[PDB]
Amino acid sequence: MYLRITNIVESSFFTKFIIYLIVLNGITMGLETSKTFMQSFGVYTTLFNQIVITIFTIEIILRIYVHRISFFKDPWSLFDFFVVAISLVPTSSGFEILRVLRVLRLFRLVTAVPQMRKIVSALISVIPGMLSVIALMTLFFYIFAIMATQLFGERFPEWFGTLGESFYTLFQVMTLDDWSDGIVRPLMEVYPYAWVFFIPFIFVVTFVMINLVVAICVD
Amino acid sequence: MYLRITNIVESSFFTKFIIYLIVLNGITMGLETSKTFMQSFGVYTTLFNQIVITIFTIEIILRIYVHRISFFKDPWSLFDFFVVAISLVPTSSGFEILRVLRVLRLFRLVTAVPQMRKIVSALISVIPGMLSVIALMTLFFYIFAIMATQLFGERFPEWFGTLGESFYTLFQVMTLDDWSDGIVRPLMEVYPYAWVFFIPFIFVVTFVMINLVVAICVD
Amino acid sequence: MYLRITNIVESSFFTKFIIYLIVLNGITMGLETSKTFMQSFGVYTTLFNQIVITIFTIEIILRIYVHRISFFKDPWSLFDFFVVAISLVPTSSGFEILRVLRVLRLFRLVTAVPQMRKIVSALISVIPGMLSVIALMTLFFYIFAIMATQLFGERFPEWFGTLGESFYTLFQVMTLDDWSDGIVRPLMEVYPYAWVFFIPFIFVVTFVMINLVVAICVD
Amino acid sequence: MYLRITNIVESSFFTKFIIYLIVLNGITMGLETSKTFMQSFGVYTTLFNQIVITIFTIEIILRIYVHRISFFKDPWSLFDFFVVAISLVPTSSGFEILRVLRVLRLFRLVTAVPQMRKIVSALISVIPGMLSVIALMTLFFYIFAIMATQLFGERFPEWFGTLGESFYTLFQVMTLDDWSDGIVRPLMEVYPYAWVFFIPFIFVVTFVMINLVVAICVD
């Protein structure tokens, strides 16, 4: 039966039938958003969904016989597996992000369709060249997040009260998001020199970030 | 008479006459801005305006006899047709954007003056090589926009209450506009973990955009 | 006496003496900032200031005899004349920005010291290659500034009430400065679709600007 | 005994033992952030800290015998000396930033591990080719900071009242942070033309910054 199904699975029809369902379930998921649409055709699309979920597990079963070990060493397939598994965790119990994480199956449109895979791959490939810098920065953040917690967290605990809070705030300063009127002018009403912490933080972090883009512009 | 007008239309004088009108009609449109000016020369200009609109339909009519089918296959010519067409819908009925969309005719200074054609074409030409990325992202936006509507739309309906609302908010976060103090800090007073949605969102989207600029800086 | 002074003017000591005065006068101007310093040594400083202003006119007089026409065809010389000229209009009358525009003489440090000249020249030289795009942009801004004034200036005159206000507001959206929570979200409370005006505006302008940087990242 | 210790110090075990304390002390410093953690194990980790602080002085003492003058001409070594010395200044007297500056020792993970060393060095190396620009800019900032103090500091002392405040505010406009709704729109309520100061300042400064990135994307 193997070559029979290996011929079904590898069929152009099959790959296109899946791509056809993704665009439908994506279109159908934009509709589940509408409280109006749901009052009318809610029962329709709850079923249609569970239907596609089966079809997708059947496929993942079919795809596994045909590829076996080869399949659990394919990034795009591994993905597809975990993304369908999520969609299988009952519409109940645990966390309800699991109900929400179901929308991640629409990323299969990236998986199932080449050129996308190409483009995603193109992107992902740039990351290893970035890991030295990314490491450097995270060390830097960690170091500064610590200083700030112990320098401003007493008076300013919303923003710096906890190590995690300082991380969030420092991230916000890095994106240069409302950094002065939002964080540093306030801080300075109590700690006049806080500028001595943040201006250097800004230079270094933006400098590094310029460098990193230039590196991605030469590899 | 065909060649008579093909020599009128194709004449340098004809083109320079048109360009001359555009600059005048453009100057006059900055004047229609002044409620003061309109109270004095308001009548002067409304007529000046209907005049140029005629002169331009005459030209488009002329330009078409000289080119026939070659014309409705020229971007720049097609443009001026539709742009002049907008300005033909009577000053009344329907929507009032049509009255406002008239000033689109000043883009004819781009259409009728070389160099601008060069630069605009330079620009437009870059877009095809971005279509793979642009799609990747729009798929991404669509996915996240759905996640956010169902994760935050009950408590935060201004920002995430509807799929389209979420598009806009997500757009704003992506342009890194007031994202933390404006949207996520508020969100977190109710959903402590919202940062788990927006920081990853910020990374991907900022990553992708650097790559896109670096790609353009290759092609 | 000509070659005598041409040997005075062209002397290393002369130039270095001038550069000496620039850095001294520049330091003195930072001190003129202090309301304290001025109560103490304000008199000390205003005389030294007028002294420097004399010396500089003397120099500029001398420099011209030694170059004649050659001088008023030197950008950097023209600058120095026009900068020293500003500092010559008496401490009284007309516009008082003239008292303030005096501090522009510290740009003589760019003018009198090479390498700076190099760097400045390096920068300025990039400009000609940008003028087609800068023209493109100004036309774009002019067209949208007009549309916005007539679409929004009635309900929102602070931001769009006048052609000039719209220019300013459009510039601000372009710097992506507080654009959503500051301008468009407000606008939309009255004009739900204003997003159809600003998102396209934002795309084009940010596109064009990226193109301009890559263009510069090639020449 | 020299070659004995020169074989202790230069050993793989030595180097990797130091790296072990850094990642341990660094972990231990994130924990001293928690006032919870400190209420239970505060005793443990103050001593652990003093332990590592001894070990680091012992090590720095050892490393100096092995290198003598060669060491005080190594940037990376000099660093570790200063950073350990900071951590020696008693947990008392003077200022409290010295207690806080202790966390700078976690930068030894950069110093004591290559690739980091490489990356940091790669970055720093880019700096000297920026110094003409960095200098140019600081002249410009100083000039405009002076102008602003005398144009806006009377009515607007929080933002432009003092030379240093003008520097800070100018920095913020340069990072394009809340500049319009935060500073210039306000300013314009009193000085209508303030846009004539900040728009040019924005152009020059944003221009220069683009040039500097393109420079770094050449060298």
3-state secondary structure chain B: CHHHHHHHHCCHHHHHHHHHHHHHHHHHHHHCCCHHHHHHHHHHHHHHHHHHHHHHHHHHHHHHHHHCCCHHHCHHHHHHHHHHHHCCCCCCCCCCHHHHHHHHHHHHHHHCCCCHHHHHHHHHHHCHHHHHHHHHHHHHHHHHHHHHHHHHCCCCHHHHCCHHHHHHHHHHHHCCCCHHHHHHHHHHHHCHHHHHHHHHHHHHHHHHHHHHHHHHCCC
Q: How far is A58 from chain B (nearest CA, A)?
A: 24
Say what the resolution is, in angstroms. Answer: 3.3
- In angstroms, the CA D153 to CA D158 distance is 8
Decide if A123 and B207 are in contact by the 8 Å CB cutoff.
yes
Spatial contact of C164 and D196, defined as CB atoms under 8 Å apart: no
- In angstroms, the CA B26 to CA B24 distance is 5
One-letter identity of residue A31? L
User: Is residue D172 within 8 angstroms of chain A, CB to CB?
Assistant: yes
A71-89 b/e (C-beta count within 10 Å ≥ 16 → b): beeeebbeebbebbebbee
The torsion region of residue D216 among left (phi > 0), alpha (psi -120 to 50) and beta comes to alpha
Mutant choice from C138, C181, C201, C202 vs B, greatest count of B C-beta within 10 A? C181
Residues of C in contact with B103 (CB under 8 A): 143, 146-147
Nearest-CB residue to D181 (from C115, C171, C178):
C178
- In angstroms, the CA B2 to CA D173 distance is 61
B159, D150, B120, D104: which is closest to C97 by C-alpha?
A: D150
Residues of D in contact with A176 (CB under 8 A): 175-177
- In angstroms, the CA A176 to CA A180 distance is 9
User: Is residue D210 within 8 angstroms of chain A, CB to CB?
Assistant: no
Nearest-CB residue to A182 (from B149, B162, B181):
B181
Question: Alpha-carbon dihedral of residues A56, A61, A66, A68, nearest 10 degrees?
Answer: 120
Q: How far is D129 from chain C (nearest CA, A)?
A: 11
Residues of D in contact with A213 (CB under 8 A): 213
User: Is residue A123 within 8 angstroms of chain B, CB to CB?
Assistant: yes
Question: What is the CB-side half-sphere exposure of residue C80 using CA atoms within 13 A?
Answer: 27
Decide if D181 and C176 are in contact by the 8 Å CB cutoff.
no
Please, what is the Cα angle at A204 between B204 and D147, to 5 degrees? 115
SS (H, E, C) C155-215: CCHHHHCCHHHHHHHHHHHHCCCCHHHHHHHHHHHHCCCHHHHHHHHHHHHHHHHHHHHHH
User: Is residue D186 within 8 angstroms of chain C, CB to CB?
Assistant: no
User: Is residue C98 within 8 angstroms of chain D, CB to CB?
Assistant: no
Question: What is the CB-side half-sphere exposure of residue C85 using CA atoms within 13 A?
Answer: 6
- In angstroms, the CA D181 to CA C172 distance is 9
Spatial contact of D47 and D91, defined as CB atoms under 8 Å apart: no
User: Is residue A161 within 8 angstroms of chain D, CB to CB?
Assistant: no
- Round to the nearest angstrom and report the end-to-end CA distance of chain D: 47
- In angstroms, the CA C144 to CA C142 distance is 6
Is the four-CA dihedral C138, C140, C142, C145 of positive or negative sign?
Answer: negative
Spatial contact of C193 and C199, defined as CB atoms under 8 Å apart: no
Residues of A in contact with D175 (CB under 8 A): 176, 179-180, 202
- In angstroms, the CA B135 to CA A23 distance is 14
Q: How far is B176 from chain A (nearest CA, A)?
A: 7
Decide if A33 and B208 are in contact by the 8 Å CB cutoff.
no
Q: Which residues contact residue A65 at a Cβ distance below 8 angstroms, ignoring those fewer than 6 apart?
A: A2, A5, A6
Nearest-CB residue to D178 (from A150, A181, A199):
A181
Q: Which residues contact residue C34 at a Cβ distance below 8 angstroms, ignoring those fewer than 6 apart?
A: D163
Q: Which residues contact residue B159 at a Cβ distance below 8 angstroms, ignoring those fewer than 6 apart?
A: B152, B165, B166, B169, B183
Decide if D107 and A208 are in contact by the 8 Å CB cutoff.
no
- Subunit partners of chain C (3 or more CB pairs within 8 A): B, D
Question: What is the CB-side half-sphere exposure of residue B36 using CA atoms within 13 A?
Answer: 6
- In angstroms, the CA B207 to CA D40 distance is 42
- In angstroms, the CA A143 to CA A140 distance is 5
User: Is residue A214 within 8 angstroms of chain D, CB to CB?
Assistant: yes
Q: Which long-range contacts (CB under 8 A, 24 or more apart) does D64-73 make?
A: D65/D2, D65/D5, D65/D6, D65/D9, D66/D2, D66/D5, D66/D6, D66/D9, D66/D10
CA-based nearest residue in chain B for residue C136: B116
- In angstroms, the CA C157 to CA C120 distance is 40
User: Is residue A219 within 8 angstroms of chain D, CB to CB?
Assistant: no
R_g (Cα) of chain D, nearest Å: 24
User: Is residue B171 within 8 angstroms of chain C, CB to CB?
Assistant: yes
Residues of C in contact with B176 (CB under 8 A): 176
Q: How far is A118 from chain B (nearest CA, A)?
A: 9
Residues of B in contact with A29 (CB under 8 A): 146
User: Is residue D142 within 8 angstroms of chain C, CB to CB?
Assistant: yes
Nearest-CB residue to D175 (from A143, A150, A176):
A176
Spatial contact of D38 and D65, defined as CB atoms under 8 Å apart: no
Give the method of determination.
X-ray
User: Is residue A171 within 8 angstroms of chain B, CB to CB?
Assistant: yes
Residue ranges of domains in chain A, CATH in brackets? 1-114 (1.20.120.350), 115-219 (1.10.287.70)
Which structure tokens are listed for A27? 């279109």
C-alpha C113, offset from chain centre: 19
Decide if A178 and B181 are in contact by the 8 Å CB cutoff.
yes
One-letter identity of residue D49? N
- In angstroms, the CA A202 to CA D175 distance is 10
Residues of C in contact with B101 (CB under 8 A): 147
Spatial contact of D195 and D188, defined as CB atoms under 8 Å apart: yes
User: Is residue B154 within 8 angstroms of chain C, CB to CB?
Assistant: no
User: Is residue A189 within 8 angstroms of chain D, CB to CB?
Assistant: no
Decide if B123 and C214 are in contact by the 8 Å CB cutoff.
no
User: Is residue C177 within 8 angstroms of chain D, CB to CB?
Assistant: yes
Residues of C in contact with B217 (CB under 8 A): 214, 217-218
Residues of C in contact with B29 (CB under 8 A): 146
- In angstroms, the CA D72 to CA C77 distance is 48
Mutant choice from D140, D142, D180, D201 vs C, greatest count of C C-beta within 10 A? D180
Question: Alpha-carbon dihedral of residues B111, B114, B119, B121, nearest 10 degrees?
Answer: 60
Question: What is the CB-side half-sphere exposure of residue A157 using CA atoms within 13 A?
Answer: 6
Is the four-CA dihedral D192, D197, D203, D209 of positive or negative sign?
Answer: negative
CA-based nearest residue in chain D for residue A167: D30
Spatial contact of C15 and C76, defined as CB atoms under 8 Å apart: no
Q: How far is C1 from chain D (nearest CA, A)?
A: 38
- In angstroms, the CA B102 to CA B82 distance is 11
- In angstroms, the CA C65 to CA D209 distance is 39
Residues of C in contact with B178 (CB under 8 A): 178, 180-182
Spatial contact of A214 and D216, defined as CB atoms under 8 Å apart: yes
Spatial contact of B106 and C143, defined as CB atoms under 8 Å apart: yes
C111, C191, C177, C103: which is closest to C148 by C-alpha?
A: C191
User: Is residue A133 within 8 angstroms of chain D, CB to CB?
Assistant: yes
- Round to the nearest angstrom and report the end-to-end CA distance of chain B: 47
Is the four-CA dihedral C180, C182, C185, C191 of positive or negative sign?
Answer: negative
Spatial contact of D81 and D87, defined as CB atoms under 8 Å apart: no
Spatial contact of D178 and D172, defined as CB atoms under 8 Å apart: yes
Q: Which residues contact residue C142 at a Cβ distance below 8 angstroms, ignoring those fewer than 6 apart?
A: B26, B30, B106
Distances (CA, A) of A108 to A15, A90, A112, B143: 12, 21, 6, 11
Instruction: Strands of chain C (E only): list them.
Output: none
User: Is residue D50 within 8 angstroms of chain C, CB to CB?
Assistant: no
